[PDB]
Symmetry: C4
Subunit: 321 residues, 4 copies
């Protein structure tokens, strides 16, 4: 036994679980609970069937992640989920052993996180497994899919998640008129969903225009959004490799944001929180192959909605992701 | 073995079976068969494969219910299915052992019930399992899903079930005019389905307006409906915590009900029985969070349809739930 | 082991395989191949994985049929699939043992049939299983669903199958006018599919009007159709219990049939054969409960389509059922 | 054990994997990498779970192909997938043993191919299995579906694949007018998809008009398309059995092709390559049964689209099949 062999036929069309973890863990008063800015945790449930004490053994499972990466992306390693639990990384820690009380059917594995300076360009995943052994007073679920957890970790701040891209247009700069003003395409490419990734508490990034997570060249196109306020204020839009991708902000108006709430009609305990970013206006060059330059004009409004179920008073736990 | 361990990945997205049991078991002449009002029974089939006598062992399965509750509702314990078979409860009884005749492929487990004063606010469930042992001349089905029964028990009287909410409007009281009459919202929130839960033979309850079973604060919003007749008459609408939720009945008209029948076009042996409740008119305060008061005006008609297949003459068994 | 126990949770929502067998087995010249009228056969494939000779043991499986009947119809025994392979029946025979040649992956189990005087009102099924034993140089497929065959046997003649009911109207006789002529409902109940069951080579039956296979009282409503020709001619419509159900034929026109062909547009090797029955005109009383009489007027055209794939020259085997 | 027995109930409604292999393997400079014209290869991934060296044993699996052929086509052997790995064939070779490095979760089985003079009329398949043994330091995946690979091999050249049939009409020649010109049906039969099979680097074949892969008489209707250029030029349309099927080309205009590109709107790294064949104009006789002749007029444009993901620079590997 020990080794299962199969042809690239793996149920790894499924397998990654999305887990949302606050970038910073704090109390209702806003003081840091896990040691500061970018320090957080996540209580991961472990279910147990059957009247004695059970010690559950949990371990890093780089193997399942490797199978999943090859099954999902083959040769395109630039798109692989990156192993957050790899040797030497200091993003995540967890106990290798968990005790379950005699008559309890659950236990919580406390995952600790240090998201400081994480580059969310890497599709960071924490792969875990329930360890099986003859010594142990238990068995990992026969359905290997249940005894394994491939966790796509998303830190979140007040401004991150999957924004609607409905208010953003993407036009191609065709040339320049007599006045030097850009000639642009009439038609627009609309990205219905734009993922806003955490950098720190007041900063996210998006990929430039139509670029997204499934682009092997992603990392060349990160656009930073810094929120210069808590619930309203200006936004600083920047690009660390501006010169490379010919990044240019429109200097006429400065972008701004506002956070606002609305009650649900059906469930009046459910609150819709919105992050609205106005006057996003920038230009950049997308380079599919060397010598081919497609200059895009990205412009409009970004809107993020977050549903808060107030039947949970933790706020960090109340989110309906 | 003995213990199966898994991450919150459980097929417990499925698992609860809805079982309809008459609140009172009686004969065609209407006399009580199980000891009186609120005393009833349910014959639960047990299937057997393979020419000897089989003794099937059945036991309470609080473990599977616990896994299902945590998998389905996590921390929101106010929404958990409550264990009807727990130590000391006198709602349900059943034999712990059932005999199957030599050449029979079925047996019936006779569940006995005492629904007197049951609070249907608790999502009462009876969790059972086929017990496996080396001593036994059988094996519980390998598909654990088949050897386990999580039964959501619904007592039923002539007036209970899932009513259509199509004829009920829910408007918000915005203020009061010069005459003191309420100013209400024009638009309405329509609950397409309103569950009518049994209290006794002539009484049900619904949750107030838009409140339903998935509200953690349900129990604060029970509206009682008492049928003052057998097949027609008035209805007494009340609320035991009226002062807390600012419950107010409209005193202009008194609500009434009527039971009526119609034959199906396709299957002329199928009878559609209707319970129509007219002139439901009341007000109450929904409190999502302390200090937030949303005063609703609930008004209209409730209609319950029940399909009776007359190719079964038991009437209590003839219902196509 | 030997006995699997489960609660009425069985995949027996599936399980019955429909098998079409010619009522009479004959050659291209129309001479009887299996001993005469109503004598037939069916070659049932048995698949084998893995270089030696395999003897497959097949047996009657009344157990699986019993589980399926209780799981599907519970107490309504009038709707059960009837066991064609039961002790003493002379409808079907088959070898209890089948040899598979050394390098072959298939074998054919020759089922022999005697359909003479079969009452298709009984939903006749032949239940079979691959027998497992330690002595045997094989194992019945782990998926019990694959090692078991619940065969709904349909004999077929030139005029049987599922007719379209689109051209048949079902109206209710409301009363009689001054001239004694019936007053009928304007609206009609349309049965989109009407099953024509074999009686013999030139006779089928349908259930009366809206009655079908899922009526517990089916047997009281059989309408016989006798084809008085090979490819055209009159039809004799009768009812053996005419007096009981107040059966009455309209004497104005005599019903007739015609068989006709058409080539498919897409697959020109595919032939659409049609059986058209015109001027079906009769009356009968449906009795849901004693004292309730619903007099129906059934009238119109019946059309049966049968697709013959001429890339099979057996004709009896060429049908795309 | 060794033999699994089942009734024609096999998940072989699924099972065949389509694999696209270049007819000729060559480098970016267009020089032959595998020995010349029609010589190619395919690197087939093999996935391994669990820290030692694993030797995987792979073997020809004619058994699974046989089960699949009987389950899918029964008696119609003219439609069976043909065994490319059968004794004496020189189309494919592969190692019977593959080594996996200590900490690797994948290995690549190098399939070598010689497609010279392959007749794609045969639905050539290469059936393989992971071999299981007690000696081996591994186990073939319990899901037999994962430990088995039934590979429908498609060689491809610049002009092959599934063409759109939208621009091709199929009309029936009804007779001839006074001038001898054909009288044709107004309505057309449109094949939405037309498969272009490889013959060599500059030649494909299609089946004549409406004939396709699921015709038992396919082989009588092969229409050859020879591309007399690299990216544009004329096309030579011929039929090796022209006299048998009364094949006739319209001599008025000569067919031609052109290869052209377009960038995707959404993914600008994705290139849509098109092969457009204009002025396809020919006649042939389809013979469903002897004595029945249906003369078709096939005319129009063929368009093949191929998506090239330039985030892969191998070009032969960049195709999104
Ligand atoms: Cl850490
Ligand atoms: Cl009790
Ligand atoms: Cl017989
Ligand atoms: Cl070779």
């Amino acid at each position: 036994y020990e080794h299962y062999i199969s042809f690239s036929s793996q149920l790894d069309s499924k397998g990654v679980t999305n887990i949302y973890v606050p970038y910073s863990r704090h109390d209702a008063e806003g003081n840091y609970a896990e040691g500061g800015e970018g320090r957080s945790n996540y209580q991961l449930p472990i279910l147990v069937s059957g009247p004695s004490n059970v010690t559950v053994h949990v371990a890093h499972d780089a193997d399942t992640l490797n199978i999943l990466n090859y099954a999902r992306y083959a040769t395109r390693t630039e798109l692989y989920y990156e192993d957050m639990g790899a040797e030497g990384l200091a993003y995540a820690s967890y106990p290798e052993s968990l005790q379950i009380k005699a008559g309890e059917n659950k236990g919580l594995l406390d995952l600790k996180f240090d998201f400081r300076n994480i580059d969310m360009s890497e599709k960071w995943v924490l792969p875990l497994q329930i360890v099986d052994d003859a010594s142990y007073n238990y068995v990992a679920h026969p359905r290997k899919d249940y005894a394994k957890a491939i966790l796509r970790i998303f830190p979140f701040n007040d401004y991150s998640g999957d924004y609607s891209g409905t208010g953003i247009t993407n036009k191609v700069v065709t040339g320049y008129d007599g006045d030097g003003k850009p000639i642009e395409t009439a038609e627009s490419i609309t990205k219905s969903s734009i993922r806003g990734y955490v950098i720190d508490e007041q900063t996210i990034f998006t990929y430039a225009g139509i670029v997204d997570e499934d682009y092997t060249d992603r990392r060349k196109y990160k656009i930073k959004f810094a929120f210069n306020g808590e619930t309203n204020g200006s936004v600083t839009i920047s690009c660390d490799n501006a010169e490379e991708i010919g990044f240019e902000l429109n200097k006429d108006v400065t972008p701004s944001f506002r956070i606002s709430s609305s009650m649900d009609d059906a469930k009046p305990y459910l609150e819709h929180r919105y992050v609205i970013i106005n006057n996003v206006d920038y230009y950049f060059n997308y380079i599919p192959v060397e010598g081919t330059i497609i200059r895009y004009h990205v412009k409009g409004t970004l809107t993020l909605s977050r549903d808060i179920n107030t039947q949970i008073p933790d706020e960090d736990q109340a989110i309906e992701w």
